[PDB]
Amino acid sequence: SIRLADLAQQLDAELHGDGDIVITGVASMQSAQTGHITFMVNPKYREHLGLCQASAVVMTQDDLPFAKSAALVVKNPYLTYARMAQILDTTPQPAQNIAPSAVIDATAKLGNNVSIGANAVIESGVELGDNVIIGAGCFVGKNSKIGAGSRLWANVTIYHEIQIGQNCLIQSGTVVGADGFGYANDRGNWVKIPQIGRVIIGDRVEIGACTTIDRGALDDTIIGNGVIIDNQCQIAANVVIGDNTAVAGGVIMAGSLKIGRYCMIGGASVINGHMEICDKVTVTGMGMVMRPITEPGVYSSGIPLQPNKVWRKTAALVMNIDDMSKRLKSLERKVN
Template sequence: MSATLAEICAALGGVLHGEPGLSIDRLASLETAEADSLSFVAQARYASQIASTRAGALIVPPALLEPARARGACIETPDAYLYFARLTQWWKARREAAEQADAGPAIHPSALIDPTARLGEGVTVGAFAVIEAGVVVEQGARIGAHCVLERRAQVGARTRLSPRVTLGHDCRIGADGIVHGGVVIGADGFGFALHQGEWIKIEQLGAVRIGDRVEIGANSCIDRGALEDTVLEDGVKLDNLIQIGHNVQVGRNTAMAGCAGVAGSARIGANCTVGGGAVVLGHLTLADGVHISAASVVMRSIHQPGQYSGVFPIDDNRSWEKNAATLRQLHSLRDRIKALEKTS
């Protein structure tokens, strides 16, 4: 696939400086770009790489126009990173359009679709997908091979399910979402009553309700609620291997990195970020705009926006061993300091 700078600017805007007919075969980082590549410099701190990159053309903000122009073609735009994001979308859509021509039938004949399911216009369904009774798939949605949509599940318009996704009965995902392979939406929440040493199952009677523009990474799990629904609001972005427990609520535009876990009934605000491997314990509340650093463990509610961290600093093993051993006596060390203060 290739495109000229003129075609790119016609589609995405920006001010073109240099040869409009320059052909771009590849989007690339500054380090790996070649003469056929379009790259971007979003921040002034990367300005020093402008002179050395071999990219055929650069996307730059006005502040970096001069050095970029000095070395060759460029596209000037207020937010170069945003322009680059939209360029990747345009590039991918174009590549996929070229491939669609020779794609198979929209509804693969091996898919099993219950006659009571309703599929909107332009829906595609992959091989061996199973769509049960009462399911609704809105227009333009794409259901990958081997997906299972249990009874009464709903998929919003243009949402794409990669191969091997389970959307449990009565669960709903809104429009313009992306769900990656292996995701399980609507498994039972983890709820038991302890009775004479045995765990008595609390059946999970709620569902999962997911808003629009939500992305869920591969092999992540969103459990159904016990009584009410588990909720992911519009614009939530989850990376891979994330666990969302039952009854959790995640606010609008909150993003979580890989391997994060949120225990049951936690309420996470809007515009939060949760770093990779971080854990939020159950029944806690996080205000809007709370940012949890990677691998940190939230053990109490957080009511003020800000960045929060809690990670044991890594060290060479020998130093760590000494400090960790001393840490187990820290409280008594404090008492010894107090005693010294009294006598000093």
């Protein structure tokens, strides 16, 4: 709960309306009621302000003539939404101080104000920085290090010799530092290659749920500062991801891929290994990334849905495209 005026100043936003309005939380435009602040990003919805029951709306200067309530004026409403949602966040912490059911090795080294949830297991040689929070049921493996302010939700698995930077956040079911898929073939038999590299995660990295990040074979898997990784992703051994890159859900990356800075990898993409993708590349969803990308820009693949009856003929024709090609050449020749 906060007064609109205080909220505006903390948001460094221009107050337009009764500053004594009490804001109790954030809500969507369609759901907002009195006590709620909301925001508008698209000018398509200016009419909808006339139907919105929020006590306040975050908008731009050109939106203000359309306002029907108190307003906060800023250059970037969506970034302002992010900040005010942080101010008014209702999300609890994964844990509150140290649980008596936690199993913590005597050689673990804890900073100040560390929290550790029920039944979490902390191995030997582990170091947890100040204000670190380990959720219920986690495992943190031998000699791993977790930087100050970092937090793990319930049931996250961290293997041994892993390094996590400051202020990171990892959601449940995620596994960091499992063995890379490393095997040599001996006349058809697979022979295991121990993966003795690590994973190094920078500062302010956020990783979603049920994502797996493998440790490197010899050198390390590396996740740069400010990277965001969604759910269900596979980041294979020795992948390197540049600062501030975003990876949407269900992405599968092959080993030894290097991705540059400020990339956006669309969900469900599949990325070949032992190759590089430069800075400022966007791959749209379900992208089949077979080759390196040397120039920034947007790249795509995939043939989208069709009615089943249509698709059947489409697929059959594509599979015989070489015969179409020949019939074409044979026809060009006949004409000329």
